[PDB]
Each structure stands twice: as structure tokens, then as C-alpha cells.
């Protein structure tokens, strides 16, 4: 069975990867070397080599190239791929999948030779039972990404040629999702590349982009390096710079995951032609609103969206309802707004048509909009840790979890936690030593 946990996921999250230490240890190392101009990780090794040749006046050419660094191992650095391995990527991908008129998705990557998102994105989407995907990897040069063709082939991927700077080829056409990963790969120009991408993106699609932020420690550190390659330096921009660039191309930011070490993960959605949105209270306890929705949804000729809003209870189950109706005919229009707050103290916003927050969410145009304790997000599915849980217990017994596998023997919590000591026939006894007999071995071996 596929085991997952249904948890709230705020749209914007900052300081995502604070819990990890290896990332923090790497950051402490990196800042140490940079100070005044030591580990198995690639980026610290590169910094050490760069500072080794010269303490001052380091050559740009020498630090650009060195043995053990010419491999595209920069993404392999735990700092570089911290957010991709974190559940932020899954959250963004699930948000992209949910907001889709059909049940088929078309995603085209750019600069996959260095982005290496093809090796991670398709796997995260296996849990979806019915979703059918089309993944294609595009790069400027045919030899680029010529390696690992077995990795590409084992997944239903398609080769490409598109250069972000120049216009997109028609083969890609109107796609649902565009993954860039500018953090490691080098774009020709922010403005031009984004303009071409949004030109390729269908009406109402998404643009998932991963990049390192200027004005932050790691961003500045990478800025100091890579001085030989100007394109890479172009990709690194301040957060406000990225936000300003986004508006210029008529693209609206719906999601933004920000790691503590400066990394960011944007999710931008192409606006769809605006239309007058219907509104329907769905909080009546007699279900009389069902008739209204039945009539409203009946007129399939109309294309106006329907916004079921429940603001009178935190236990309204509109999420499952919109999930179910979206599969039914006419369900491409359904959208939700739910105010579920778990704390009495926390305030309740106003979702009046004139209100500003309703305007913001409408600009977003996202199916699920849940407001839980001062933040907007939606419920998302995350695979839970495989390791079995444990706890301290004075009572526990040895048991072979997998019959006939001596390597499966482990201590398990015993029922002797609950017992009565008064009964003379009970006589609970502590165990200091226990013996093994032929019978025990026969049971263990199976």
C-alpha cells in the first residue's frame, strides 16, 4: 500500500529547511571559507580549491575549471538541491496537477542537462493513480544531456532541442507545466527566457522555477564564483528583482517556497481570460444549496466560474465535494473558498466581493483556497517516513517481523504494560536472563 499523510501546506513558506543540520553544517563551512577570501561535499571542495591556488587575486579561469568539479555535480551539492529533496517540490507539483481542466498533464523541461529535474519530477507523480503524464527534456545542444540516456529511456521521456532565449518550437505547443531549475543551469537572459517560456505556456498553465536568491549568503557566494560565465550570473537575482520580472511578462505568482539558506522555488500561473465569477454560499445546514448548484451547473453553455464559499463553519467538507464534482461533467468550473480555523483566538477574515483578500485569491484562480490560522493554502498528500515508530517501554518482547528472516528480529512493545498485580495467580516477574532452545530457533527460521 501507498501510505500518505493529508496535511495542510501553506502557499508561501519561509525558512523551509531549518531543521536539517547537514545543510546548516555545509552553510557554516561555506561562510568560513568565504571569510578572509574541508568536506566531502562538492561545493566546499570547489571553494577550498579556489582559495588554495591563491589567497588573494584568484584567477577567474582557474576557479571556473578544476578536477573533480567539471562534472555537473553542483546540483548534487546538498545545499543546491535542498528544496528539491524537501517536500516543497511535491507540494508545488501537486498544486499544478490539481489545477487542470483535464486528467492528462503535459510538462516540458528546459536545460535538463544540468537541471536534472527529469530524474526527480516523474517519480513524485507515481502516487497519483489516474494521472497520465508526458515529460520531455529540452536543451540547447544535442550533446548536452547525451549522457544517462538509459535513465531517460527507463522513464517515458522525450528528447528536445528548445533554447529558452529563442522562440519555442511548435512540438511543445500548449503545455501545462514548465520546469526550469535556473539554480544550476544557465539561462541566456531572465527577461527573454521568461518571455519565451510564457509564450510557450498554455492559457492557465504553471511555471515552476528554482533559483538561488541574490542578497543572501549562498547567492553572493556563487556570485563571487562563476565570474567567467555571465549567463549564470544573470540567473541570480534579488527576490524583489524576481518579483518585478514576473509582472513584466504578465505572470502571477501563486506559490513561493523559500529555504533559509537563500534558495527559492517559485510557482507562477499564466492568467486566464477574466470573466464574471459566480458566487454560491454553501453553508446552509439543510443542503438547500444543492439545488442552486444543480441549476447553476446545468447551463453548460456558460463558462463563468462557480466559487463555493463556506465561511460559517470550520468543519464544512467542501474540499471533498469540489474534488468529486470536478471529475463530473461541468466540473472544470468548480472552485472553493473555505475558512477553517482551529483556534478560537485567531481572527476570521472577510471574503466579501469588495474585500481585498477575495480579490487576491480570485487573481490566484486556484481550485482549493483554505485559510487556516493566518495563511492561505490547501491540503496536500505526502508520503510518510518508512521507518517504524518506537517508544521507551519497560515491557517488550523479541519477535521476528518477517517470518523466516533472522535479520528481522527486533524488540516490540508487549502487552504486559496493562496488568493487575493483586491476583496471586498472576505473579508478574522481571526478566534478567532468558534462554534459547531448539524450538525458538525452529520458529525463528520458519
UniProtKB/Swiss-Prot annotation:
Q: For the modification Phosphoserine, which residues carry it?
A: 39, 276
How is this chain modified after translation?
In adipocytes, S-nitrosylation of Fatty acid synthase occurs under physiological conditions and gradually increases during adipogenesis.
Q: Which residues carry this modification: S-nitrosocysteine?
A: 336
Task: State the source organism's domain of life.
Answer: Eukaryota
Could you tell me where this protein is found in the cell?
Cytoplasm; Melanosome
Tissue localization of expression is: Ubiquitous. Prominent expression in brain, lung, liver and mammary gland.
Describe its assembly.
Answer: Homodimer which is arranged in a head to tail fashion. Interacts with CEACAM1; this interaction is insulin and phosphorylation-dependent; reduces fatty-acid synthase activity.
Share any extra remarks.
Answer: The relatively low beta-ketoacyl synthase activity may be attributable to the low 4'-phosphopantetheine content of the protein.
What role does this protein play?
Fatty acid synthetase is a multifunctional enzyme that catalyzes the de novo biosynthesis of long-chain saturated fatty acids starting from acetyl-CoA and malonyl-CoA in the presence of NADPH. This multifunctional protein contains 7 catalytic activities and a site for the binding of the prosthetic group 4'-phosphopantetheine of the acyl carrier protein ([ACP]) domain. (Microbial infection) Fatty acid synthetase activity is required for SARS coronavirus-2/SARS-CoV-2 replication.
- What protein am I looking at? Fatty acid synthase
- Species source reads Homo sapiens (Human)
What part of the full protein is here? 1112 to 1581 of 2511
